[PDB]
Short mmCIF file of C-alpha atoms in Angstrom, two decimals:
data_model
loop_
_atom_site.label_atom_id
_atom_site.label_comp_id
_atom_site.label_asym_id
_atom_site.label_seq_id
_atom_site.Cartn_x
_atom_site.Cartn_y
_atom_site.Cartn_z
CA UNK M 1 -2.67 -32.11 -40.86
CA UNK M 2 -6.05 -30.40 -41.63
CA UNK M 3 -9.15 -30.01 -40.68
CA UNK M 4 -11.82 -31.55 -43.36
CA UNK M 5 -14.52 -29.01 -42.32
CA UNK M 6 -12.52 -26.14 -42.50
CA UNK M 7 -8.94 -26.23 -44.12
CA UNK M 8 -7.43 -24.91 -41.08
CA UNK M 9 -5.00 -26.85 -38.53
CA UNK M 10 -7.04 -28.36 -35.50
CA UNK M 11 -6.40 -27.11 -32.23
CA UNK M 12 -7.74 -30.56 -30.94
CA UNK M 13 -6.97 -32.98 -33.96
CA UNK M 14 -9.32 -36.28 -34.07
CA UNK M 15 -8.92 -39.17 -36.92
CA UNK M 16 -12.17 -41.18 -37.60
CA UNK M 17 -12.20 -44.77 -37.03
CA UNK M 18 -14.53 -46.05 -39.61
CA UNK M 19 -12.54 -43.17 -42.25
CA UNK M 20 -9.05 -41.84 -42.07
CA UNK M 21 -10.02 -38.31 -42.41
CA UNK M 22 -8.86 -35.62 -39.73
CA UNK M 23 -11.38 -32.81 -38.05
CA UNK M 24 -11.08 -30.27 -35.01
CA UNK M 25 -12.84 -31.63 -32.51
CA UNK M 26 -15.09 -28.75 -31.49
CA UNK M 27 -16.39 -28.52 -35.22
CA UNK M 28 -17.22 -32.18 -35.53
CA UNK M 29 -18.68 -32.84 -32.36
CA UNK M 30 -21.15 -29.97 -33.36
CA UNK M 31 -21.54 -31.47 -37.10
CA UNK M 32 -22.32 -34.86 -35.73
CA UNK M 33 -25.00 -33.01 -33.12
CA UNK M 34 -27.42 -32.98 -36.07
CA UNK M 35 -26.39 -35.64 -38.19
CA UNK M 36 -24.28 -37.74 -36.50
CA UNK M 37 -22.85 -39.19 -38.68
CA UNK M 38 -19.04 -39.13 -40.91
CA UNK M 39 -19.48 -36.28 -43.97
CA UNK M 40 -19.50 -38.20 -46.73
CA UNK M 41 -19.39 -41.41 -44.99
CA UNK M 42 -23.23 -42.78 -44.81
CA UNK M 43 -22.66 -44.92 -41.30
CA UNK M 44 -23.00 -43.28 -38.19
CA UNK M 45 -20.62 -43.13 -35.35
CA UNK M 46 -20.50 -42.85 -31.63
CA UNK M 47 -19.36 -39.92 -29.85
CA UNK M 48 -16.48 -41.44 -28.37
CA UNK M 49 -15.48 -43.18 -31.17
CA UNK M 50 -13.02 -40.19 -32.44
CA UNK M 51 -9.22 -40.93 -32.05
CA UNK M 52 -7.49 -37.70 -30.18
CA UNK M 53 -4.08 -37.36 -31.56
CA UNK M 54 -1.38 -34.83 -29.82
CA UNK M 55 0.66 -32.15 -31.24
CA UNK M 69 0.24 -5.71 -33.27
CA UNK M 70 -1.61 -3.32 -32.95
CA UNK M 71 -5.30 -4.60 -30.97
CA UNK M 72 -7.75 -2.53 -33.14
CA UNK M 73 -5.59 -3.89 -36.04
CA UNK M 74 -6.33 -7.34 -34.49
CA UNK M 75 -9.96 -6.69 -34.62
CA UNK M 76 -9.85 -5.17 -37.65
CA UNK M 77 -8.14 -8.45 -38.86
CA UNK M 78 -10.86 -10.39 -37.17
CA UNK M 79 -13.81 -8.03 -38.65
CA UNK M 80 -12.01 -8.68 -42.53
CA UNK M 81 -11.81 -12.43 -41.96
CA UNK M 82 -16.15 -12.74 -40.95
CA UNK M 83 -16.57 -10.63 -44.04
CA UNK M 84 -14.62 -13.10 -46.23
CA UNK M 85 -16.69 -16.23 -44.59
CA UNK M 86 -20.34 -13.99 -44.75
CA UNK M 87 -19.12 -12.98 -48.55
CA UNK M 88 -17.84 -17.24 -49.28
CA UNK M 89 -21.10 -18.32 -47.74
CA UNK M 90 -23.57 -15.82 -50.02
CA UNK M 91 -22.16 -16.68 -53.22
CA UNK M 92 -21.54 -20.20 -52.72
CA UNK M 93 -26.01 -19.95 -51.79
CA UNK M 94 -26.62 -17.80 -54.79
CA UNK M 95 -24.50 -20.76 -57.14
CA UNK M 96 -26.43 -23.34 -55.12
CA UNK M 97 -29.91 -21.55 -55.49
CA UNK M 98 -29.13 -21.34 -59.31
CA UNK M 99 -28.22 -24.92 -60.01
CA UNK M 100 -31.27 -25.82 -58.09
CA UNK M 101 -33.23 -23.98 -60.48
CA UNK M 102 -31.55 -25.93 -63.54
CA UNK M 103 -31.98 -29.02 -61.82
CA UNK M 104 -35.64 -28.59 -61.56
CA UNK M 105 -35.61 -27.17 -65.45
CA UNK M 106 -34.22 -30.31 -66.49
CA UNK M 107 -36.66 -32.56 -64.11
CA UNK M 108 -39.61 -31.23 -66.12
CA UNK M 109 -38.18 -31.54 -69.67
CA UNK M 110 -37.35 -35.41 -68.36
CA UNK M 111 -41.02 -35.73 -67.41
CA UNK M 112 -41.97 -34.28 -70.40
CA UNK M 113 -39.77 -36.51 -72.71
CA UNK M 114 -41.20 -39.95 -70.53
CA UNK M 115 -44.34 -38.74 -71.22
CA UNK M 116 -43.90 -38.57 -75.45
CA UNK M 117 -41.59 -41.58 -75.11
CA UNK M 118 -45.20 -43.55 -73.43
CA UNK M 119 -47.24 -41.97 -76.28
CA UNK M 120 -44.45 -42.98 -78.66
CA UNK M 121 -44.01 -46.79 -77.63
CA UNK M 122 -48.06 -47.01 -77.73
CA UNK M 123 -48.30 -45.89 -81.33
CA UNK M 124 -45.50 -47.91 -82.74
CA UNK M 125 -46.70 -50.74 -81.15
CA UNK M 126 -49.82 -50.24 -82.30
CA UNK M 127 -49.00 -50.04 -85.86
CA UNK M 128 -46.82 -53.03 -85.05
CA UNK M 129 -49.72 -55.10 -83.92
CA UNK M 130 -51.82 -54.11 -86.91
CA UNK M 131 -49.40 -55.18 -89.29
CA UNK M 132 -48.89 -58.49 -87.87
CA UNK M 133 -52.82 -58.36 -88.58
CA UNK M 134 -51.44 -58.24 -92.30
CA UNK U 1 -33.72 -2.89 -42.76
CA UNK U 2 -31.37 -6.24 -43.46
CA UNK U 3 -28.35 -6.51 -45.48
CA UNK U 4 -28.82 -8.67 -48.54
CA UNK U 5 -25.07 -10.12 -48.36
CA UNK U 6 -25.10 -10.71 -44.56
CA UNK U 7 -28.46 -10.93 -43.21
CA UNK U 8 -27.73 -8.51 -40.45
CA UNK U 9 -28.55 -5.14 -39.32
CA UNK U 10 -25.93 -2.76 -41.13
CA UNK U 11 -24.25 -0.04 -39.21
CA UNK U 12 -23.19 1.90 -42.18
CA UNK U 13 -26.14 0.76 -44.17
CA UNK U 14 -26.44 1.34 -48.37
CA UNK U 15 -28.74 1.31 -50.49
CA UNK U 16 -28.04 0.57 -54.60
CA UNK U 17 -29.35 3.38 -56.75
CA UNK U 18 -30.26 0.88 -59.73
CA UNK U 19 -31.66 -1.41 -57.43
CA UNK U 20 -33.55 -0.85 -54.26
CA UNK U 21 -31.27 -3.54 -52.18
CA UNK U 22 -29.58 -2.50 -48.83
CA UNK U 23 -26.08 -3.83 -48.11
CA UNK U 24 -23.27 -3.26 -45.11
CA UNK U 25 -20.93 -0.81 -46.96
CA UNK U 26 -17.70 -2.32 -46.55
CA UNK U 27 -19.57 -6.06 -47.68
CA UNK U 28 -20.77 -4.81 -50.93
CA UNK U 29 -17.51 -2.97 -51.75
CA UNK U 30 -15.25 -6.13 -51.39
CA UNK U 31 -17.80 -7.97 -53.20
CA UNK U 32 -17.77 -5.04 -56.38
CA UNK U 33 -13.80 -5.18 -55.58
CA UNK U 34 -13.52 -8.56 -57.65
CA UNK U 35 -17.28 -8.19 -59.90
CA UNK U 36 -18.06 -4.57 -59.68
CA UNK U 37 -21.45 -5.41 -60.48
CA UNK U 38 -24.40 -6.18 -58.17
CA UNK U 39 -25.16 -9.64 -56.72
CA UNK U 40 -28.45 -10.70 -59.77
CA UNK U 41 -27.91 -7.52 -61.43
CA UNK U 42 -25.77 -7.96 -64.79
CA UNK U 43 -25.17 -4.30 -64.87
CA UNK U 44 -22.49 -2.67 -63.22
CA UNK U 45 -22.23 -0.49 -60.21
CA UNK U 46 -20.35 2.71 -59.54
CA UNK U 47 -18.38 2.96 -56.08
CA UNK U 48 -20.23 6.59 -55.62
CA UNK U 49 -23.19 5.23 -56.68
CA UNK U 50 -24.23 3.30 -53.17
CA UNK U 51 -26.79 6.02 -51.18
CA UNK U 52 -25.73 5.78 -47.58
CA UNK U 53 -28.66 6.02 -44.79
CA UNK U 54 -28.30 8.01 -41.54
CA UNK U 55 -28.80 6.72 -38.19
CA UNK U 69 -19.77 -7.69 -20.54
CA UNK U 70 -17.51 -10.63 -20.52
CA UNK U 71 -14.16 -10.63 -22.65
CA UNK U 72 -13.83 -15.07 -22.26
CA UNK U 73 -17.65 -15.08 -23.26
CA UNK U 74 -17.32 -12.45 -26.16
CA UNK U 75 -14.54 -14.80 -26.95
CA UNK U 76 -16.12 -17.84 -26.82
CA UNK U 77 -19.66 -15.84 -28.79
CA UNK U 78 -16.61 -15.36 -31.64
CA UNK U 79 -15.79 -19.07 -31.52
CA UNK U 80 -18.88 -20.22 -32.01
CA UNK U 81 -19.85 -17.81 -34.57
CA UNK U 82 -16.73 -18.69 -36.66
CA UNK U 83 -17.70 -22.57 -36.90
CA UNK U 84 -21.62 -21.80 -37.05
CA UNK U 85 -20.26 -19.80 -40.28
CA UNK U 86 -17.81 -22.87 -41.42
CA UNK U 87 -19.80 -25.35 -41.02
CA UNK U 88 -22.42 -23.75 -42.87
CA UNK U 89 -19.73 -22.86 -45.85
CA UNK U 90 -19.09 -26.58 -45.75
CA UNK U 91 -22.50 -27.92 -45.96
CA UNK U 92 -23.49 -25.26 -48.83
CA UNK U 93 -20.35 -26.22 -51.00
CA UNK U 94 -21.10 -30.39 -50.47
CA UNK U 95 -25.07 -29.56 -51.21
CA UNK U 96 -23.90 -27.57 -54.37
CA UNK U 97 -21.25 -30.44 -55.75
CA UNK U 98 -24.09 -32.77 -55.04
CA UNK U 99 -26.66 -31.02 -57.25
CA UNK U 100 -24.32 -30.22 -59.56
CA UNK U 101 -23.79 -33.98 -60.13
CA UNK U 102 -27.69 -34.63 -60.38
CA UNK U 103 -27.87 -31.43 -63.04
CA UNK U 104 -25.12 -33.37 -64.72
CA UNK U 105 -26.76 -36.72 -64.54
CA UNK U 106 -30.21 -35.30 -65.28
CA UNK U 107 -28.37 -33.64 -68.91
CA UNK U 108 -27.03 -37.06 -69.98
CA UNK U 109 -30.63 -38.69 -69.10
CA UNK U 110 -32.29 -35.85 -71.58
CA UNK U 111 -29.76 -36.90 -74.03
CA UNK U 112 -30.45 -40.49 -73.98
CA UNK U 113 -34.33 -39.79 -73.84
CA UNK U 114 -34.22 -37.71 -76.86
CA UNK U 115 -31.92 -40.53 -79.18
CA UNK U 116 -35.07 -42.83 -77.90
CA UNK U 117 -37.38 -40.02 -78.84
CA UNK U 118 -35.66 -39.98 -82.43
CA UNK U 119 -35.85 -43.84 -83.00
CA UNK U 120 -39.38 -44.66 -81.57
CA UNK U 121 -40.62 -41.23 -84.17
CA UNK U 122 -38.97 -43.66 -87.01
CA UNK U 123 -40.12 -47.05 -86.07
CA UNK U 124 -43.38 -45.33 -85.35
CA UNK U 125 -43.54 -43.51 -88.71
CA UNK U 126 -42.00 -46.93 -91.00
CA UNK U 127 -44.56 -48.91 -89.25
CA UNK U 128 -47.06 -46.10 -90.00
CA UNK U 129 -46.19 -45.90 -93.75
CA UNK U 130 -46.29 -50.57 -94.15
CA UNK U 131 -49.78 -50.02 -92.79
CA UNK U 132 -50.29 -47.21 -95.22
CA UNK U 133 -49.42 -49.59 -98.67
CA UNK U 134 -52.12 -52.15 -97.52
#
């Protein structure tokens, strides 16, 4: 009984119909505004198309609050900074691959034509 | 003038001593609470080491809160799927340089014992 997007219990649970996977409505109504479509499902679906299902001190409270945002801005940074990083890799290893296809061409040119010339006898 | 962890204007703003990056005070603490060092900076960083700087609506402010809270989900959600997804290309990219460079290895001796039968006639 918990939300996909964010781990938490939904306030306003909704099942997909095209997956079985549960979301708070607010949060996938505004996921689906830009992409409109299921996370990792690559079909789209209608807006209408999700299943509803039914069920201190106050500066303390804010200070609760105020500790929770820093958690999310804190989660957020460092999950950038690990994305930012294997992006980087990723774009090492794209140029080494371009590199090796390139000496693999030159490589498969040369043997066959020492190939060729030997069949010349 | 922007916090490096946050992106937003810092009301008790710091500045590192062996860097010259500005951070909220209480963000960069709880991030040296579990590293102790800063953010790209292998070294670490003393706690009295951070050079401070001098200087409507309750439903709405609620609802500003709300909205703020899934902006910040949903964007901790789409960083985290972006990251596996990379991560799997990094990984596929690695086992593509592996197989390239066995090719690399056995074209370099076809090449080379084609090379060498041209070489005796």
């Amino acid at each position: 009984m918990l939300c996909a997007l964010s781990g938490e219990i939904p306030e306003e649970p909704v099942v997909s119909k095209k997956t079985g996977v549960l979301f708070e409505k607010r949060l996938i109504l505004k996921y689906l505004e830009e992409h409109n479509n299921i996370e990792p499902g690559t079909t789209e679906e209608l807006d209408p198309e999700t299943d509803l299902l039914p069920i201190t001190s106050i500066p303390s409270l804010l200070k609760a609050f105020q500790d929770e945002w820093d958690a999310l801005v804190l989660e957020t940074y460092t999950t950038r900074e690990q994305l930012a990083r294997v992006r980087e890799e990723l774009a090492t290893a794209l140029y080494q691959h371009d590199a090796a296809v390139r000496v693999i061409a030159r490589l498969t040119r040369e043997r066959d034509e020492a190939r060729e010339a030997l069949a010349r006898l």
